[PDB]
């Protein structure tokens, strides 16, 4: 199978309940860590018998409830929320924000977890060649940290190709974040997750959307046979459905860590959506 | 595939749950906008993995409930209803109006969405050559806006070939509306939609009609195999199943915008059906 | 194809779910109206894409439930039932009447509509040459309307060749009704209809009869392939599966209308079956 | 084709689902009635379009359930069962009686009717020359009706050639019954009937026997092509698959009717099998 | 054709689903009974129209299931199993015993019966000249019935030519059993039988063996044409496919019956295979 | 015909589904055993009626599945696999290894057995004169068993004519193995076997190769007539299609058995292909 | 027979399914390699028994599918496609390109291989005298590799006799390529190959063309006898039907290898057809 331990993660564009254009969390990025059934040196893989099943149901009354339901599946190591406008750039976040503004409807989220294994690290890491080469091209200073820098977070959101930004090294830092994300996975449960978002008016007006992580693309969620076939494909293509992350600056040389932290703060503001 | 972004739309004759004489919404009209996987300049196309699945169920107690269920899939940009006798000239609207008048039966609508991609524009447009040539033949004044004009909306409904109307420029304006519609699509979800309208008496008397948007014509809705084959054809022939529109007068020169707005108001009254 | 718009219809001998000796409703009669894809002057034809599919299921607890299920597919213009012992002379009506008398069984009717087009008129008609010549041979008076006329409805049912009837003009009127029916079709949905009448005892004792309208004769209803081939023949030979009728006396000269109405009343009693 | 209207019928040896040594009901006997597409004087023939299809399924828990399933297809005029040990001398009855005694198995019967026409009489009949000559040789008294007659029903079952019986006229009466039966057909549906008797143990142990009425002998019931070819031969050789009978004594002179009724009662006991 | 009524039958070496070295049951032996379309005195022959078709399917989970499936086609008169290590010396029994020991596979048996006639006796028999002469050479005592007789069943299985056995009359008795068997057929269905033994692993690993009784040798079971030609040869060479037997000692003089019963018990142990 | 009982067998070069350069298994070697319809002393021959037909189908997902499908037809006495790189030097093994490496295709194997007889031995054998003379020329020691012997299995694979090997007795042992093989047949089914290896891409892209054992060379597998003619030649030239073998060292004097076992181990490594 | 091992091959003009003007691949060129049943030094020849039969079927939806079906039979050593506009100058490629442009038809390719032997080399080669003399006349530089050289690939396609090209050494290099090709065969299967290209409209409109490699010219593909006679001639005149090639520059002196590679690139562009 595919190893997701040590994968990069964009906390702003991520969404741990899924995305219609991906079979997994849209924030997962190429592998950042390099490793040595089989146990990776410095970590562990614990395989399950069939699928470890769990279900959750939540009434999502506001954006904060939705944020909390996502943070449960994509948090910092230990369970604390990532914060910093996490998930706010994903399609699912913008879709729910529209529905929760309508005070005439109420939405519920029903998660169904189909976990197949758990993996994690415990801590002297080596990064991939791609990540190391990317880091070697980074400067030691983030230009937008300077006060009255022409390239602000608002300027980047409006036009990143403007002269105010293309003269600074800000585009170099953002290209790095766009490639590898802002965090990386240190612990994960992999398998499948089928989530139903059910909206009821205030007429038995009910709407249901299905969001799927893991396995092969499912043809029909309402078909009993098509749902069962999807779970059989989850064994073949398991993907992270609940994970914990560590900030990426821990993997950079110390002279670049402060600039990268400023870069992800800039990135969270320019790409992330505050509730406005 | 076929581009439906920028397609004209007749809000009066349209019906976003379908029509037995069309594989799509019968209000979709030839392309009005001209554009430059591949991204259109000024817009975007977001392709999905397999099909983005959603289902809705609603009890349709009166004509207003049916109107609301259609407006969900064909609205103004932002979600507001088009209004102005929208959908009232379609076959499906007249069929449901007959069934809802019978107080001894109750009808439910079950939608099944099979969305394959999303497209939209964000706003300096260029129209098609057909639309530009059509606009160049339009006058600057709509004759029926003049008080005591012999060609009224009622006169047009009774006999549009009468001398009262053929002397005015009203037939020229209506031929334009009949060709391109009254609005145009600015955002759309494309794919397939299978809707069941289920009517129960007050005897297990139950009637079910199937209405299909998108894909190839389905041979048997009750056959499990024929339904699955239809979804496989939805990948090949996706069509708009939920979209948002902007009024067409925004695309006309300013000296003709006021006359066109009067023309669509006239058109909505003469062709559209008030609940009488 | 064959035009059924304006066809005569015997409401007493008709049966809109079918007959084992006909591929269509056994009450359909030769064309009464003459007309001028292609649109008939004074009417319309609306062709469908593939087949417009609808299904109904009903528990038939008594003869009235069966009558209602037939009246749905063969009614007066507007939806009102024809009445006047409608369908009571058909084989299917007599078959169901026998089964419903057995209180130890319960019967259900499952309709499957495969509609291919809709046609209708809106109202100065011209009748066929056969119908006009038939009308010219009719008297102005119906003899059995006279009190104490020897030829009563009971006498006609027992022996129509008796002297009591052969001396009156009653046989002339009945020969006209036997040729053209009592009504004529003004609106129709054409295609195919497969109806299952399922009877369950009170042992999994279940009986199922198949009744077919439209297309070519089907070899095996249980064969999946033979059923699909039948639908392909429905495109070639579509027939009325749900229609609305107008009384034939509207097409006769005024001096003969009252006598014809008395003739169809006589015909409905002598040929039709009251529930005895 | 061959006329079966008015055919004699042995209710004891008959079996309306078939017999391996006959292509039809083994109780059908040579024609008893003589008659004058073409309509027989005093009766009717109603030809079907293709085949009128019906299917039945029944769980046969005991001998009474099997008896009821046969009586459905061979009953008295009106639907009442013939009774009097009907069908009990047929091979199929004895075969099923053996299987139903095994309480470790369960048997189901699946009938498939392929009806091609219906025929019947309504009531002054004339019998065939063979039947009239047979009746002329019958006595006016049945000897075994006399109390303490040496030739009893048990004596006939043990040895009909014994002196106790050969001295009476009992062998003359039984030879008549053996030639023409005990009843005669007054109404019938003709065509084909394929019946499956499926027995399941309590291992997927399932047994299926095929019993066929009508058409040409079928080579392979499991072959799809061989089954379809059989139905094509049903058009050529249709045979009664569901019929109603009247007792034969109605066709005898009154002075012999009472003796014949005693003869068929004797015959039903001596040849028929009580459940012992 | 060839008469199999009264044929000898070796219950130990027999196998009613067939043998690759025979066209029939390998336990059928030369005729033991002598008899006098045509009906044998004391018995009956009932000829079928074409072929009486029946099919069975069974999952054979252990040796007992296989034994039961064979006993269905070769049993004592009345249906009771023969027992006494029946069928255990046949090639097919040893082949299946090997496959059922593999717990990683599952085997199914599919029987297809093509019965052409039934024959039987009801009970003063006369045996053939060969059988009578064979019986006249038999002693009145079976030597191995004596306790501590050197010729035991184990000794016969190891070396029947040893001095321990050649001094006794045991070889005389076994030569009789080897010629005529242990039972004889009293009732039989004759025709053809094609049986498929299908073994599936736990990869779509499936194995199928074909075993044929009756008719001419079939060239290709997978060829549709070669299978149909085989059935045409079944009419020419019908053989017993389901029969009932009676022990042979009923045909011996009373002074030899007890010794013969001991001989068949000895034979069943020495030649038959207990599940070890 | 030709006796294959006691034939030598090269387990490394063998392939029981065939070879394009042989009409039989390419591992069959000249006769090793000498023997005395007709029964060989110490063994048996069981002739079949026509052909004993069996068919198998298997999806071959990896090299292990292919190995298992061959081991079914060429195993140790009892059914255990030979192992020791069996079949790995055959052309068919190398061909399949290439196709299974392509993860974009899937291959199935369809076997069709046409068995004509079975033969075997039960155990004091005498070998042929050729085998005895060959054994007399063998040393008592295998030189490559000595540690740090210059002639290793790798050295033999690279250049067997090098000085490192030509000085040892290794070439003498390998010439013996090349002549007689490593095992010998103790039980066999002889006849014909036609195997189809069908490869499907992931476009209906399908490839099929035919591999034939037994009979005369077939001109066209797709021709129905040419296939039937091949089976007629299988009767004339039957060859082993499923057999069991015993190691050859059992036939050597005890002082040479250990050296021969080391020789076949050396041979299996130098000539056989490990999955690299 | 004729040796094709080491034959030159024009990858641009070649076509491994055939050509109407050749009995073999039209890209095969005279022998380039010189060698020493009989085994060539440095290579091998493996003769088959009769013909090794294989069949393939493929739906050719676009030019890429056709390219893939040819590349299967003419690839680089190892199976990788040659590329570089391979096969694009052959008649068959241009014929199929015309048919695949018609979106109203669908074409399938059915290959039938009749392989008689396999040959190959493993690697110090010696070339033929013709090839060596040809190479000695080649320059060390390819003139068209120089930027702004008047003789471009387009100029060569339009007029190779123009002054722009006749002044350079380009015609010398192209004459060499035209004589010996661009690659040479290192491994081959020889025999016959009959390929059917079947085109169906969307009326049972079907077209079939036959393309033949190997043997003598066949008179009638539809004649069963003429097809069989062709296979008998395949034994006499076997030709390569599936082969692998190595680039010719490996056979040139190192000082000319770079210029020859530029020459074949030039040749592939000037003679080969890009999909325009
Ligand atoms: C990668 O890091 C591990 C410790 O996590 C270390 O054992 C290993 O040596 C490193 N890789 C290499 C190639 O040395
Ligand atoms: C069409 O409009 C786009 C902007 O939407 C513009 O870039 C383009 O130049 C216009 N078309 C042409 C032919 O110029
Ligand atoms: C038939 O009636 C139509 C109107 O329904 C009329 O236009 C036409 O003239 C009539 N037929 C003829 C032959 O005039
Ligand atoms: C037979 O009976 C019919 C009435 O069922 C009668 O009309 C006819 O005359 C009779 N046959 C003859 C030969 O008279
Ligand atoms: C054979 O036995 C039958 C009774 O089964 C008997 O009728 C006949 O006489 C016997 N055979 C001879 C030759 O007598
Ligand atoms: C060959 O061996 C058999 C036993 O398998 C033996 O009977 C025979 O005597 C041996 N051959 C000779 C020539 O003795
Ligand atoms: C040709 O090359 C071979 C090796 O492939 C070599 O053995 C031979 O000597 C060469 N030809 C001549 C004439 O030497």
Numbering used by the authors:
A (entry chain A), B (entry chain A), C (entry chain A), D (entry chain A), E (entry chain A), F (entry chain A), ...: 465 to 500, 514 to 600, 605 to 683, 727 to 800
Share the article's original sentences.
Toxoplasma and Plasmodium are the parasitic agents of toxoplasmosis and malaria, respectively, and use perforin-like proteins (PLPs) to invade host organisms and complete their life cycles. Escape from the PV, and therefore from the infected cell, for subsequent rounds of infection has been shown to be dependent on the perforin-like protein TgPLP1 (T. gondii PLP). We report structures of the membrane attack complex/perforin (MACPF) and Apicomplexan PLP C-terminal β-pleated sheet (APCβ) domains of TgPLP1. The MACPF domain forms hexameric assemblies, with ring and helix geometries, and the APCβ domain has a novel β-prism fold joined to the MACPF domain by a short linker.
We first obtained oligomeric crystal forms of the TgPLP1 MACPF domain by the use of in situ trypsinization in crystallization drops. On solution of the resulting structures, we found two related assemblies: a ring-shaped hexamer and a helical packing arrangement with six subunits per turn. The helical subunit arrangement was formed in a crystal of space group P65 that diffracted to 2.03 Å with phasing using anomalous scattering from a single platinum derivative. Critically, the helical assembly can only form crystallographically with the trypsinization of TMH2, strongly suggesting that this is an oligomeric form related to that generated following membrane attack by TgPLP1, because cutting away the helical TMH2 will mimic its transition to a β-stranded form. Biologically, no cleavage would occur, but the TMH2 region would move by spontaneous conversion to a membrane-inserted set of β-strands as part of TgPLP1 activity. The orientation of the subunits, with the TMH regions facing inward, is exactly what would be expected for the biological, and usually pore-forming, oligomer formed by MACPF/CDC proteins. We discuss the functional implications of this structure below, but this is the first crystal structure of a MACPF/CDC homo-oligomer in what is likely to reflect a membrane-active, and possibly pore-forming, state. In the crystal structures, all subunit interfaces in the helical assembly are identical, but the ring oligomer has three different interfaces, with three, one, and no main-chain hydrogen bonds, respectively, in contrast to the six in each of the helical subunit interfaces. The subunit interface captured in the helical oligomer could occur in a membrane-bound ring of six subunits, although in solution, it has relaxed into a helical arrangement. In all, these analyses suggest that the interfaces found in the helical assembly are more stable and of biological significance, although the resulting functional oligomer remains to be determined.
